[PDB]
Amino acid sequence: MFEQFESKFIDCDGIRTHYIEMGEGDPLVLVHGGGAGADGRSNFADNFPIFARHMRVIAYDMVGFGQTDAPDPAGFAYTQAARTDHLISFIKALGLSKICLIGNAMGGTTACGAALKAPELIDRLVLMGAAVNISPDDMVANRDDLAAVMSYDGSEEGMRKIIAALTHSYQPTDDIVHYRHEASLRPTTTAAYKATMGWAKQNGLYYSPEQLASLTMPVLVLGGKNDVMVPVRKVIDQILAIPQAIGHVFPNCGHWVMIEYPEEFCTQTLHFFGKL
Amino acid sequence: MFEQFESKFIDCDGIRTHYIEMGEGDPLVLVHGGGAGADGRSNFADNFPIFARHMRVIAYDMVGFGQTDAPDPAGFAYTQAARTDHLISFIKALGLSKICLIGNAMGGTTACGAALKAPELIDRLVLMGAAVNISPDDMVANRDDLAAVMSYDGSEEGMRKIIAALTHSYQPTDDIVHYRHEASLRPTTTAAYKATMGWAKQNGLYYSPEQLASLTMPVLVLGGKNDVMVPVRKVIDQILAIPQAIGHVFPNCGHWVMIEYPEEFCTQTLHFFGKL
């Protein structure tokens, strides 16, 4: 699946990184969600053609995910800072400056982190159901809805469970499910995933109110009103905690804003990027 | 001022009602704010040309306001229901059906009320810093920032105070201030205003969560993040209390969304109306 995009690869301080790209113009980098089997292709396939008509759009696979290297977690710690540093490295490896950047959930943690740490690279930020204020306690507090993703058994039913919980009125195709299931099952990505989630569960995906307020560039915060993974009140706190943030809440919409309402998602983001 | 629009008048069950209109296509009715001196012309002058390029746009003066009749409050009670019934009457007087409707603050109370009471007339609703969940206690709780409008002395400084509190980074022209000051001073509108606000202060501008949830048509809820009159948390509650509501929060923006960011306001509303 997803062979309509050309797989490309580049070295990011020793991490071999898969990405796809399309279109021309200013660079736009998309960062996918952190659930089992997720990658750039599968998260953003529906948005890519629309974005490509106006920008040079780019979706990479996060360290531990997809076709990017998944270093053995016997020797590699799967921390937020590792994702964050990976992203920063990726942007530099490609020679990109002044990017627009969109992050989904954990990809949102990562996009935020990179915006905090290397803001000179990033002109505009979009946080889409971003896990940027989810403490360890919040994880425990939302343990029931997070289980499908956090304690993923490795089964097909498990993957259907993950997607049911990422969505409000979206039926994925068998092909989508099969793709993420099969991807999830590679032994290296399985182990990197368990480490990834175990660390998330213990440490949270979190920045402090003061950290969020220090972001130096324009921000668009998006969220599905029915999102069970990053609940709308968390998205609302992000809007309030980030002085300059535009906020936009989507009704009849679960976590997967970009897939449930691909045109509206693209419209609102492209408009925010000055492309409409 | 505002003579670039043609004043027109029509009888709404014995209330003689001023309105302006422009453009062609589907009807769009705008309902102005309830502060001293407010009317359709002055609230929506900057938005009217933009809306006119795509819709038949219409701004009327609420009973007690502008150039609409201000019946003696010795014999007329200035209740929400009176505004609400006035609006419903206006829509019918004009023979309009399936309108798009936008209400600012008290104009928002009125637009909501009419959407609850006569939903068959209204295809789409926009609440812009709408006073639709402000209880008597909330009024008292926000008494300090509401004073400029609630206990308006009648002076020019008083009117500058009203506008400073309606805005975050907007300097109105002398002409805007003078217009609203002079309008505020007509003896009939002064008395209707005191009655209007006295009743607002005692009864609130309020609908119950259950009432809000019963709205039957699509809804767009807008709000300036720095709004001191209808604070952003109240706008956020509206978004959450209305299942189908889209939500959009504007940064660096006070109550007067339509004047501080006229293009963004028009863009977002026209998009929601299906005109972009």
Ligand SMILES: O=C([O-])C(=O)/C=C/CC(=O)c1ccccc1
């Ligand atoms: O496509 C996906 O895997 C996706 O959008 C996942 C979102 C879940 C996620 O990254 C998350 C993890 C822990 C807590 C909250 C959110």
Ligand SMILES: O=C([O-])C(=O)/C=C/CC(=O)c1ccccc1
């Ligand atoms: O232009 C205006 O007068 C305007 O936008 C006024 C808003 C204030 C308003 O109607 C209001 C009254 C009481 C409480 C909250 C809000």
